[PDB]
Design a protein around this ligand. Structure first.
Ligand SMILES: O=C(Nc1ccc2c(c1)CNC2)c1cc(Br)cc2[nH]ccc12
Lengths: 39, 156
């Protein structure tokens, strides 16, 4: 049986850690909601 | 149980100890998460029960107690923050510039941040603190790391 626990407020944080790149990927989405890469 | 707006962990006592299967957003008395987190099962909040209201396996979204309320969208230009809630770890905001998933039905924002699968359902925010989508449905690239779509539902 699944249960929920509060973890925080939803707010923008000034000066948060900035990481990650911005890739442009060609993808396909199937009936089961699964993405796959089209290359 | 607790119905205060905010981010929540989705836990299960079915496996060894207490396991985090995902995350969700409580907004306007409705709990929003990804379909693959709960598979549409009922949830408990304290002594109260949350029943599914709407869901779709292809969008990979589900709402409890009422219809999907989140409708903010990534503007296509600005940075965003993933409010990551990883298993056993404190909620932390991570800022990033989204990439793009190009599909036959249009483009969608994507966040290139890799976290354990039990982080699925963590909200992605704009600079006003509005939830523009949830993190946790995407693809595995050459490196073995994850790139998630910014998945948003429709507010009827
Ligand atoms: O598997 C993941 N997500 C998922 C699972 C099941 C389904 C869907 C998406 C949509 N259709 C059913 C996942 C999520 C995250 Br945050 C990091 C990940 N690293 C590797 C997989 C992964």
């Amino acid at each position: 049986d699944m249960y929920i626990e509060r973890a925080g407020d939803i707010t923008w944080e000034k000066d948060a850690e900035v990481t990650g790149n911005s890739p442009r990927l060609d993808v396909a989405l199937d009936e089961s909601g699964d993405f796959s890469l089209v290359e | 149980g607790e119905t205060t707006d905010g981010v929540y962990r989705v836990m299960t006592r079915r496996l060894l100890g207490s396991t985090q299967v995902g995350v969700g957003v409580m907004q306007e008395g409705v709990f929003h998460t990804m379909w693959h987190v709960t598979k549409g099962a009922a949830l408990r909040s304290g002594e109260g029960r949350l029943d599914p209201y709407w869901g779709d396996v292809k969008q990979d979204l589900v709402s409890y107690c009422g219809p999907w309320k989140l409708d903010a969208a990534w503007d296509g230009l600005s940075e965003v923050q993933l409010l990551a809630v990883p298993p056993g770890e404190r909620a932390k905001n991570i800022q990033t510039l989204p990439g793009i998933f190009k599909t036959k039905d249009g483009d969608i924002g994507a966040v290139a941040l890799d976290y354990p699968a039990g982080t699925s359902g963590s909200p992605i925010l704009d600079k006003c603190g509005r939830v523009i989508g949830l993190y946790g449905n995407g693809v595995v690239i050459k490196n073995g790391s994850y790139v998630s779509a910014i998945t948003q539902g429709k507010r009827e």
